[PDB]
């Protein structure tokens, strides 16, 4: 109310509200709205019932705020919330999301359009077991990947020659063709290309591949060759990975869809888009960006050894004076995978894992400025709690679970902003998309390179070109890296991110950029009696520092 509120009689105010909300704009005023307006004409007692313009303009502002939320034919108990919004209308706006809460969007080959898919948690019960994907999900996952790759290839400028589906190769011979699909080994043990139409065999004896790519099983490839019906051999003469596209050109095909929706989202009922505030937020980001710095550390910071703790203490000593905006720790937090202990005589490995994080809370006590001003991010490593329980330190499921709450009951209480996410995690800045992914890449692509019968900066160039042209974080079949059936969309590089935080302990540090995106390659947290960590300036500039 006002300083001198006067309780109203609802019947006499009824015409003033009803006229505005039922003849000019709006509809179907409820009792809650009328009671709210009673309170807020108590907040506007000044000469009211004889003063028109002030209450009328407040009502039209109310309408201008209300009519942008859904359709709003009824006014529920949110009305007080929009009135608080009215009061408040007289760094934030950035979000970090994990692979668990990413929205699902299918792709339809017959409608050439992305389709929203309801999340199982929002509509389903989810109290017993809602996280288990259905059987046909793994059937359709490769179909979805192939459809997306087909669309991406056919949108290319050069291709307007046309490829031919595999099954249409039975009746012709001694004619050149062009085709693409999954590359794998058949049951017999020969090289084959698989397509939704069918599969053929590959002749490799005279192949000249395009250099600069890691030709690996499980990767989309473009094959030009001559069919031969005497056997079933598609004699290959050239081979190249499909080209990639920048962010804006892929976006405009769907305008600007609300995939990573922070301003607005789409769901089953409606589809939403936005480009008006993109330039405004770009201009906002262009300023005070140097003040909003975020620094990342190396991989596999084991919290058991004394040397790592001492180096970390020195890093925090240098850092506490100037706390950044975001701080990220990546890699495993224990040098030995945790699993079943057959002996009760010694400390349980789970208890040791709990103990290791407890000391970190103690070390946070002497760096209060960092704990007070900078949020903290933790990303699980290859041999942390849940994975190593069944993987025992080897590669496992990629949509990895976050750090369990039961073993982090003190870090959440000491620090004020800590977020645990999956191994692939996506953050949403004002005008930037950043993704972080921690695993082993160079060794994997080196060991599984395909063989062709016939200065270290080139290897990272090949790796980046391959991972960006393929457009999928895990270009490997289900034999190598098992993936949860439904969450595969999280690993998709549909509209490629602005910056990629690609950490590989088997690769040297790099700061390359390619095709509208830039990639950073942090190394291990320590090496050769030294420790290092890197920071990235939001103005597309990078810095490297070493403190031993």
Partner 1 sequence: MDLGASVTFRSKALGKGIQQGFEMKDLSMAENERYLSGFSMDIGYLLHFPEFFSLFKSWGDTITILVINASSLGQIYKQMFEKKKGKIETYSYLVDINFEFVYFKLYRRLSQETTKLKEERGFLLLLQSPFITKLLGTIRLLNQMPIVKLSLNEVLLPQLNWQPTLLKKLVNHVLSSGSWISHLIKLSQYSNIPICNLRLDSMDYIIDVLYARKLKKENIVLWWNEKAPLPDHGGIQNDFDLNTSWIMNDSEFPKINNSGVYDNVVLDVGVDNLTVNTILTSEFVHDAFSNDALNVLRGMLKEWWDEALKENSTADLLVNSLASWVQNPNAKLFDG
Partner 2 sequence: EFKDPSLSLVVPDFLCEYCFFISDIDFCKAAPESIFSCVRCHKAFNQVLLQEHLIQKLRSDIESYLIQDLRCSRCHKVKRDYMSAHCPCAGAWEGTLPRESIVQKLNVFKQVAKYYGFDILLSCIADL
Q: 94 in helix, strand or coil?
A: coil
Helix and strand element counts for the chain (H, E):
15, 21
| Span of 62-70, 331-339, 361-369, 511-519 interacting with partner 1 by CB under 8 A | 331-339
Among 175, 346, 528, 539, binds partner 1 (CB under 8 A): 346
Vertex 486 angle, CA 490 and 498, to 5°: 10
Question: How far are the Cα atoms of 97, 227, 418, 502 from residue 522, in angstroms, in the given order?
Answer: 21, 46, 22, 7
Cα 348 to its chain centre, rounded Å, is 35
Kindly tell me which of 3 and 306 has the beta carbon lying closer to partner 1.
306
Residue ranges in 286-315 that form contacts with partner 1 under rule CB under 8 A? 306
CA distance 419 to 403: 10
According to DSSP, the residues that pair with 472 across neighbouring strands are: 492
Give 360's Cβ-side CA count (13 Å radius).
26
Does position 393 bind partner 1 by CB under 8 A? yes
- Please, are residues 18 and 7 in contact by the beta-carbon 8 Å criterion? no
CB 334, min distance to partner 1, A: 11
> What is the C-alpha separation between 91 and 117, in angstroms, rounded?
32
Interstrand relation of 221-226 and 233-240 (parallel, antiparallel or unpaired): antiparallel
Sole binder of partner 1 in the list 345, 455, 528, 539 (CB under 8 A): 345
Closest CA to 55 of 11, 95, 15: 15
Residue 350: name its binding partner from partner 2, partner 1, none (Cβ under 5 to 8 Å by kind).
Answer: partner 2
Determine contact, residues 242/469, Cβ cutoff 8 Å: yes
Q: Specify the length of the chain in residues.
A: 548
Q: Which of 396, 389, 503 is nearest to 442 (CA)?
A: 503
CB 247 within 8 A of CB 495: yes
| Spatial distance between the Cα atoms of 119 and 289, rounded to a whole number of angstroms | 35
Q: Is residue 184 within the footprint of partner 1 (CB under 8 A)? A: no
Binding partner of residue 479 among partner 2, partner 1, none, CB cut-off 5 to 8 Å per kind: partner 1
Binding residues for partner 1, rule CB under 8 A, total 27
Q: How many alpha carbons fall within 13 Å on the CB side of residue 350?
A: 12
358 binds, among partner 1, partner 2, none (CB under 5 to 8 A by kind): none
Q: How far is the CB of 342 from partner 1 (least distance, A)?
A: 5
Q: 349-388 mask for partner 1 (x: CB under 8 A)?
A: ----------------------------------------
Cα–Cα dist 521/136, whole Å: 37
Q: Which is nearer to partner 2, 476 or 533 (CB)?
A: 476
**Binding partner of 405, given partner 2, partner 1, none, CB within 5-8 angstroms per partner class:** partner 2
Helices in 287-427 by DSSP H: which ranges? 306-319, 349-363, 368-373, 385-391, 411-414
Whole-angstrom distance, CA of residue 399 vs CA of residue 334: 20
Under the binding rule (CB under 8 A), the answer on residue 339 touching partner 1 is yes
- Specify whether the CB–CB gap between 82 and 64 falls below 8 A: no
Q: Could you tell me the smallest distance in angstroms from the CB atom of residue 199 to partner 2?
A: 7
Q: Compare residues 65 and 480 and give the one whose CB is closer to partner 1.
A: 480
Q: Where on the chain is the footprint of partner 2 (CB under 8 A)?
A: 128-129, 131-132, 134-136, 138-139, 142-143, 146, 182, 184, 187, 194-196, 199, 339-345, 348, 350-351, 386, 389-390, 396-397, 401-402, 404-406, 477-478, 482, 484-485
Compare residues 85 and 335 and give the one whose CB is closer to partner 1.
Answer: 335
The one of partner 2, partner 1, none whose footprint includes residue 142, by CB under 5 to 8 A per kind, is: partner 2
514 makes contact, choosing from partner 2, partner 1, none, with CB < 5 to 8 Å by partner type, with none
Residue 478-507 contact track with partner 1, rule CB under 8 A, x = bound: -xxxx-------------------------
Q: How far is the CB of 493 from partner 2 (least distance, A)?
A: 20
Partner in contact with 136, chosen from partner 1, partner 2, none, beta carbon below 5 to 8 Å by kind: partner 2
CA distance 446 to 444: 5
Q: Does 392 bind partner 1 (CB under 8 A)?
A: yes
Q: Quick one: what does residue 443 bind among partner 2, partner 1, none, with the CB cut-off 5 to 8 Å set by partner type? A: partner 1
To the nearest whole angstrom, how small is the minimum distance from the Cβ of residue 380 to partner 2?
12
Minimum gap (Å) between residue 138 Cβ and partner 2: 8
Using a CB cutoff of 8 Å and minimum separation of 24, what contacts does 532-537 make?
A: 532/298, 533/295, 533/296, 533/297, 533/298, 533/315, 534/295, 534/296, 534/509, 535/293, 535/294, 535/295, 535/296, 535/324, 536/294, 536/296, 536/499, 537/289, 537/290, 537/293
Output 65 or 363, the one with its CB closest to partner 1: 363
Nearer to partner 2, 138 or 292 (CB): 138
Longest dimension (CA), the chain: 99
Q: Say how many CA atoms lie within 13 Å of 22 toward its Cβ.
A: 13
* Selected binder of partner 1 within 112, 132, 208, 394 (CB under 8 A): 394
- Of the pair 156, 506, the CB lying nearest partner 1 is at 506
Q: Which is nearer to partner 1, 152 or 481 (CB)?
A: 481
Q: Of 135 and 306, which CB lies nearer to partner 2 in the complex structure?
A: 135
Count the Cβ atoms, other than its own, within 10 Å of residue 477. 18
Least separation, in Å, of the C-beta of 500 and partner 1? 23
User: Cβ neighbours of residue 175 under 8 Å, at least 6 residues apart?
Assistant: 226, 227
Nearer of residues 129 and 306 to partner 1, judged by Cβ: 306
Instruction: State in angstroms the smallest separation of the CB of 215 from partner 2.
Output: 18
Fill in the per-residue mask, 428 to 457: x = in contact with partner 1 (CB under 8 A), - = not in contact. ------------x--xx--x----------
Q: Which residues bind partner 1 (CB under 8 A)?
A: 306, 335-337, 339-347, 391-396, 440, 443-444, 447, 479-482
């Amino acid at each position: 109310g006002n300083v001198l509120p006067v309780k109203i009689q609802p019947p006499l105010l009824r015409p003033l509200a009803y006229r505005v909300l039922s003849r000019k704009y709006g509809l179907s005023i409820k009792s809650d709205g009328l009671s709210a307006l009673a309170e807020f004409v108590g907040t506007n007692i000044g000469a009211n019932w004889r003063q028109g313009p002030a209450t009328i303009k407040f009502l039209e502002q109310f309408a201008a705020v209300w009519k942008q939320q859904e359709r709003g034919l009824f006014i529920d108990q949110s009305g007080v919330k929009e009135v608080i919004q009215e009061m408040k209308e007289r760094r934030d706006y950035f979000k970090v999301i994990n692979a668990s809460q990413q929205q699902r969007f299918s792709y339809n080959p017959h409608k050439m359009q992305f389709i929203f898919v309801p999340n199982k948690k929002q509509n389903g019960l989810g109290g017993i077991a809602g996280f288990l994907p259905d059987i046909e999900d793994k059937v359709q996952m490769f179909l979805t990947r192939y459809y997306l790759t087909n669309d991406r290839v056919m949108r290319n400028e050069n291709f307007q020659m046309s490829i031919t589906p595999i099954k249409n190769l039975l009746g012709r011979d001694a004619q050149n063709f062009l085709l693409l699909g999954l590359l794998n080994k058949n049951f017999k043990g020969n090289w084959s290309l698989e397509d939704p139409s069918g599969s053929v065999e590959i002749d490799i004896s005279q192949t000249i591949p395009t250099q600069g790519h890691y030709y690996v099983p499980g990767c989309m490839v473009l094959v030009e060759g001559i069919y031969y019906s005497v056997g079933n051999k598609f004699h290959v003469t050239s081979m190249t990975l499909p080209p990639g596209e920048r962010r804006e050109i892929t976006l405009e095909t769907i305008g600007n869809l609300d995939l990573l929706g922070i301003h607005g989202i789409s769901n089953n009922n409606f589809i939403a888009r936005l480009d008006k505030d993109l330039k405004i937020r770009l201009h906002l980001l262009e300023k005070e960006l140097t003040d909003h710095k975020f620094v990342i550390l190396g991989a596999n910071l084991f919290l058991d050894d004394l040397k790592i703790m001492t180096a970390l203490s020195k890093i925090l000593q240098k850092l506490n004076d100037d706390p950044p905006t975001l701080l990220i720790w990546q890699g495993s937090f224990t040098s030995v995978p945790v699993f079943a202990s057959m002996s009760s005589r010694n400390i349980s490995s789970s208890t040791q894992f709990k103990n290791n994080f407890d000391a970190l809370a103690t070390l946070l006590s002497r760096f209060d400025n960092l704990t007070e001003n900078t949020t903290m991010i933790f990303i699980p490593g290859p041999n942390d709690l849940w994975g190593s329980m069944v993987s025992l330190g080897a590669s496992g499921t990629l949509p990895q679970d976050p750090i369990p709450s039961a073993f982090t009951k003190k870090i959440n209480k000491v620090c004020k902003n800590v977020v645990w996410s999956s191994n692939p995690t996506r953050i949403a800045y004002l005008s930037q998309e950043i993704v972080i992914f921690r695993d082993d890449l160079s060794g994997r692509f080196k060991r599984h390179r395909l063989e062709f019968p016939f200065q270290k900066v080139q290897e990272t160039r090949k790796l980046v070109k391959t991972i960006l042209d393929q457009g999928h974080l895990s270009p490997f079949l289900d034999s190598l890296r098992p993936i949860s059936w439904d969450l595969d969309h999280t690993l998709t590089l549909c509209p490629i991110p602005s910056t990629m935080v690609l950490c590989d302990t088997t690769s040297a540090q790099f700061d390359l950029t390619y095709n509208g995106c830039k990639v950073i390659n942090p190394g291990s947290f320590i090496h050769n009696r030294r420790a290092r960590y890197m920071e990235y300036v939001p103005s597309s500039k990078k810095t490297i520092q070493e403190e031993i």
